[PDB]
Design a protein around this nucleic acid. Structure first.
Ligand SMILES: [Mn+2]
Ligand SMILES: [Mn+2]
Ligand SMILES: [Mn+2]
Ligand SMILES: [Mn+2]
Ligand SMILES: [Mn+2]
Ligand SMILES: [Mn+2]
Ligand SMILES: [Mn+2]
Length: 204
DNA sequence: CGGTGCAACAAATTGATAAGCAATGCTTTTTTGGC
DNA sequence: GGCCAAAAAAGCATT
DNA sequence: GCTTATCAATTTGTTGCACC
């Protein structure tokens, strides 16, 4: 129960036959690079499905129509893996994990009245080291926002005196930014095996 | 290529609970690039 | 697309 | 071990992107 970058490119390849696999493969790598770049240096404001497609056009010389179907399928395939209970591991970027959470005490932050947090399965993203280095090294760029999938942004870490957990020796750590992913509604619903029933949908 | 509309976003409240992380060497998985 | 040895990244330890 | 994230219900303002 684990999907990799290559296993993902393989499924996107056998679903994009009208496109040469090598291009299907080059595409995913360009997307992930465009994505890392955005979070690391940014420069071009928020990243979106359109910017990722335009980029594949410019860069790979792909039809604007194919870059769009691909970008969409790329994230669709990831959702399919997770919804099926599979962990998605994209080397050089990060891993999308599934966690079963038990019910725990909550409340209406405004009123204060206790209201329990139901048990559920969530999608979490663990930034890889390759990526974490780029974001602290570069300094921090823009966010990524893909509706229905999730959004990536940067959270700030204040400087602090840390310890080498092996030796217990103190270490002086500088401020830096770290990537943070937020699963979008579609992905949370599909991945959470506790809501595939008559939904939540009323007006008052 | 450009204008609209609207559900999916971000931010904001509190507080109990769950998850992640500083350094870094050895082990394991993944990818790379030739053939 | 499969093989393969080497390089890179990740996994683990503990994180 | 200490720090950061998770989440509840609900409103106010923003934006990705489907659809003209
Ligand atoms: Mn262009
Ligand atoms: Mn299934
Ligand atoms: Mn955030
Ligand atoms: Mn090589
Ligand atoms: Mn490493
Ligand atoms: Mn252990
Ligand atoms: Mn502990």
């Amino acid at each position: 129960m684990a999907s990799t970058k290559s296993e993902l490119i393989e499924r996107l390849a056998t679903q994009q036959s009208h496109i040469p696999a090598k291009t299907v493969e080059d595409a995913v790598k360009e997307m992930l690079e465009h994505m890392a770049s955005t979070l690391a240096q940014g420069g071009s404001g928020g990243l979106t499905k359109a910017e990722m497609s335009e980029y594949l056009f410019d860069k790979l010389g792909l039809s604007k129509r194919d870059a769009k179907e691909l970008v969409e399928l790329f994230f669709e395939e990831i959702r399919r893996a997770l919804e099926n209970g599979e962990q998605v591991k994209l080397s050089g970027f990060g891993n999308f994990d599934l966690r079963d959470k038990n019910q725990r005490p909550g409340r209406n932050p405004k009123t204060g009245e206790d209201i329990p947090i139901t048990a559920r399965r969530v999608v979490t993203f663990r930034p890889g080291q390759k990526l974490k280095s780029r974001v602290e090294n570069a300094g921090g760029g823009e966010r990524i926002e893909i509706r229905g999938f999730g959004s990536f942004s940067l959270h700030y870490r204040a400087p602090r005196t840390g310890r080498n957990p092996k030796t217990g020796d103190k270490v002086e750590l500088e401020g830096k930014y770290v990537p943070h992913f937020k699963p979008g509604k579609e992905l949370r619903d599909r991945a959470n095996i506790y809501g595939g029933s008559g939904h939540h949908h009323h007006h008052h």
